[PDB]
Design a protein around this ligand. Sequence first.
Ligand SMILES: [Tl+]
Ligand SMILES: [Tl+]
Ligand SMILES: [Tl+]
Ligand SMILES: [Tl+]
Ligand SMILES: [Tl+]
Ligand SMILES: [Tl+]
Ligand SMILES: [Tl+]
Ligand SMILES: [Tl+]
Ligand SMILES: [Tl+]
Ligand SMILES: [Tl+]
Ligand SMILES: [Tl+]
Ligand SMILES: [Tl+]
Lengths: 312, 312, 312, 312
Amino acid sequence: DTNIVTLTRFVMEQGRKARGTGEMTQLLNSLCTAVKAISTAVRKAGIAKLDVLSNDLVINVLKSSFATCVLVTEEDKNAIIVEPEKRGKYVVCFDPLDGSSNIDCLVSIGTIFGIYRKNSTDEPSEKDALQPGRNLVAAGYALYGSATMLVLAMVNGVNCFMLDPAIGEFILVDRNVKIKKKGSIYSINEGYAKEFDPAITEYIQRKKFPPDNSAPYGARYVGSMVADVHRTLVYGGIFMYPANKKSPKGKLRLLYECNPMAYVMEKAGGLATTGKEAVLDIVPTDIHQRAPIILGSPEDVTELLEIYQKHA
Amino acid sequence: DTNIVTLTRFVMEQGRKARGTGEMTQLLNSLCTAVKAISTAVRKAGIAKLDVLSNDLVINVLKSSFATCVLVTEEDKNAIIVEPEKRGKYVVCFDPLDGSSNIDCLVSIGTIFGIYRKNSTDEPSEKDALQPGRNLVAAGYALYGSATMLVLAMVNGVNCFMLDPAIGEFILVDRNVKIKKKGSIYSINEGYAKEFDPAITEYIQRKKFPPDNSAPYGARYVGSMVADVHRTLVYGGIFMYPANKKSPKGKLRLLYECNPMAYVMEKAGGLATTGKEAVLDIVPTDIHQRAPIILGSPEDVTELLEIYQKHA
Amino acid sequence: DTNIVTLTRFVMEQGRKARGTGEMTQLLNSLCTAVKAISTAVRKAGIAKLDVLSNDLVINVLKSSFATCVLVTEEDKNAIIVEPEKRGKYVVCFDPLDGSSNIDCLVSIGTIFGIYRKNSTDEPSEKDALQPGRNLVAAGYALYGSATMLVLAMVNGVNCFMLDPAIGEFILVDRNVKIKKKGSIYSINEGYAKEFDPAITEYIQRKKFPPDNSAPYGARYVGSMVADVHRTLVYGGIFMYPANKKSPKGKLRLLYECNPMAYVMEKAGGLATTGKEAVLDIVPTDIHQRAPIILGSPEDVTELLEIYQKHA
Amino acid sequence: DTNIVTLTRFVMEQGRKARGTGEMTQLLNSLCTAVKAISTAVRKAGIAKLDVLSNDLVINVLKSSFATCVLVTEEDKNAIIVEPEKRGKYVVCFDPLDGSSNIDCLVSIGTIFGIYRKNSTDEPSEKDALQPGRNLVAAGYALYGSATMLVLAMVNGVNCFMLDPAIGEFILVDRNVKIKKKGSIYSINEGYAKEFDPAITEYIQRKKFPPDNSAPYGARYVGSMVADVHRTLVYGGIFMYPANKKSPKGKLRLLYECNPMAYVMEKAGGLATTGKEAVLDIVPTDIHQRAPIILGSPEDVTELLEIYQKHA
Ligand SMILES: [Tl+]
Ligand SMILES: [Tl+]
Ligand SMILES: [Tl+]
Ligand SMILES: [Tl+]
Ligand SMILES: [Tl+]
Ligand SMILES: [Tl+]
Ligand SMILES: [Tl+]
Ligand SMILES: [Tl+]
Ligand SMILES: [Tl+]
Ligand SMILES: [Tl+]
Ligand SMILES: [Tl+]
Ligand SMILES: [Tl+]
């Protein structure tokens, strides 16, 4: 096909008619090189830590885009303040290999990422990173499934891209994605049944045993955030990782997990909340600050927020 | 790798020990070709039903193997009788592509197959396929996730090969696989909560709220039989697709879904029962009949089985 | 490897420390997408005109870099003046599939390219393209051989890049390349023996039968410009496609053949001449204007220029 | 493609007609695996001798085939005798990787092999390999250029398969190949001009300056035997590596270079003579002996042969 839409071309038709210098583009391009290598390594996984190496990889490519100043990793303490010579205006937040554990069982996992723009006239510090999701310029993730699909959500909406392994380019496959309004799938680890706050518990029973005599929601849960979000994004559904006492303020770190997802979600007509407040407005204080997250189709997030409101 | 132990080097080398004709090797070598092609089809089945390409593909590779004579496919009303010029001693039942609907959400999908030996002297027929799972000589499945995997269970063991895309060969990685006795995961579509029979519903409870003040089991359910079974085999645990009111005879078909996995399971030291009898011991009356299926790490399936006749 | 040098990263460390906006980079990146697709299509050539499609491809990607204004193809009459919305400052000259004929015999072929910068304050026209090689900002070519290697020569020197088919990135493999000073290979189509100008003819006899009793030069000639230049670039050697009467002013078009090569050559310490004047200083008058070209190791070009001088 | 005719589907299907044991198929299937791996090794043998990985690889695949017993490799002083546990009825001579030095310049390289049947009853030995080329039962070569090709010539024809990297299978593309009677290309290292014998040197002349006021032949010489032979087979013409003073016995070794190509040539209706006798009719005395080789479209080789005894 003589007219292929590589994501490079596509972001160049978002971040160029907008006159913004297309810095974004080189940052994104670089993320692709890293995402691609992670996919190859993972496909041949069992024939050749992976996340450390994928961390190193992401960082290196990132720096070299000459479009970053601060970087936060799940795998790193201090947010990496990019050296001066290669600086640029963006703050990138990431989980390079989400699900490192799950490779062994061959379950789809991914590289999540959040991006910010430094809102200051100074020298970078991890404070430049402590902005809330409402200030994300773009967030996305790449899933290493039966295909390697990159989902990128910028201010206009969400577009899925898939890796054509032959030409090695993320090709555009879905434009301006919008989630289903209501779903039929609730995804959550019911092993934690006992420790669930009552709001959640009433909800699970409402999905399993619908009072208003419909059919019970189908339970799903790959147990990989990337996978469950994506099934949620396309097929609709509600995904919940509320807090219990074991992980008292939840398990998913805000910064580069709850937030990038929640942004992708909201741009696609999907709510994302902690249970009290939306995940995109919490003022982030520690780069590794955790937060509960409930995302998915609006009419379900809402069917649960009512319930949460009806309990305090 | 220099002395690359291909699936074929492996199957041919063990085949030599039966002082045989070479058809197992031909069969499997040909099946492999359907698998690579399906894997490739799936890795880009979003850049622009599938079941059928996958299906026609399998029938084709298998006819030409000169090793088949009766083929039972999920997709065909009747069995397929291999033309004489090309008939051989084996009978293959297979689901060519499992969970096809699940490919939109990027769920790890697969091809499951079971191979029988035509023991009788008359014209090949369905009856030959109407053998108990116990009788199989070879089984496994090919998984299509982050990597393409082929687990093959024969008289001597269950083994795992992963396709190396660089060379288009299936290479041996896990040898003589054995499942953990007891483990921490139950896998079941909890959406059918109101449908389940008491035995199950008590067991679910026992795992979430464990009576011995222990750690509860985790919940998993990818919703693609192959991903869940492969998880159950590698990490240990239990998977269940019990009969319920929407499906009193089970959902997962016997000949091509239940019996192969069942066989692979028992060969690794797990069990697979319908709660009332071994899956492999069922004598199929119809080539398309279903079965309840509870497979996994022994002690757990057992814990269940007791609950069955603790309720009998 | 966590620190991969993709050509994107490499040109970004040439066209960024130089403050030039890295427009160049997106142009180059785009050429890579096209180059990559051509390689895939060609590898699977005999299992699926190719140059028309590769022409269309190059053009499309090119336009979309938002870095071009004029484009000249071997396969096109009127140099394509890029539409305004996607304009930029560069003029790109190219032969998308050099050797279209040779695919059938499985001989390495390539995509050559020359780049200019519009030296005017107006509306683009093919005049913007009629600059001589001395005004090329960068020239290169990609070879579709047993590997797909891109050779890129900018003002600093030449760097070879090779396609790592797994991650799909041109990885850097040779920095600041310099040709051998003297060679031992003369490459030319001696079928044309008869029509050769005497300067050339004395030279062939001097290579075959060395008067100063050394050993005869090895004759080579893949009969694909890309291939012969590249063998010339690395192993040294002299490549000659002088004019005869059949192709009286030679066969290779200046614009996107003789010139990009000659530039690559000169930046690597290799002369390139028509026989009278250097190929990089001829004022180009017709985009399809032809020119003789002799390139390669300095001490040989020179061993031949003497001879040419000694004949007029 | 659905009914993909693999090299194996092909070799197995013709093998059935000899009412055989299945070793040709095993042999070739195993050889294929060495080829893919070498192709892959070459496609990235610049991102960081080779002969040896390639070599060890071939010996390995072939021992394990359970089809060999004597193996004659370019690289080993002595023949390799397959251990009894693994011996079978075939003898394979092969150059594992040809023109290794030519990989730096990206020259299309290849693996050439010839297979014999051990007819005698004693312990396998060199003598078995000391058979005339006429006696071969199977031959061909695998080319590694823009695409990886496997030409296989057996009793019934010469056929061409191209490796489809997407599936890791060699697929049949050209069927029952036949060379053109006469054609327009001579191929020879003209660097040895002062070394050649009169017969050749007159013939060269006759083609450059054709006496019948005709179109001269074109000159080609990639300098990698496989590329030139494959060209000669597909497009017609002549290739020559005549004996000269630097090499009076020819350069190209007989058993593994000359005889296979020779066989492939004659099977397509070309000829291959040393100028004094058919290449295939030579009875090798040493497994490493060389031969003069002139192969190609009949009429031309003939035109030469006459010149031989027009000079006798
Ligand atoms: Tl992680
Ligand atoms: Tl994480
Ligand atoms: Tl997490
Ligand atoms: Tl299916
Ligand atoms: Tl199924
Ligand atoms: Tl099923
Ligand atoms: Tl061309
Ligand atoms: Tl050209
Ligand atoms: Tl040309
Ligand atoms: Tl060699
Ligand atoms: Tl050789
Ligand atoms: Tl040779």
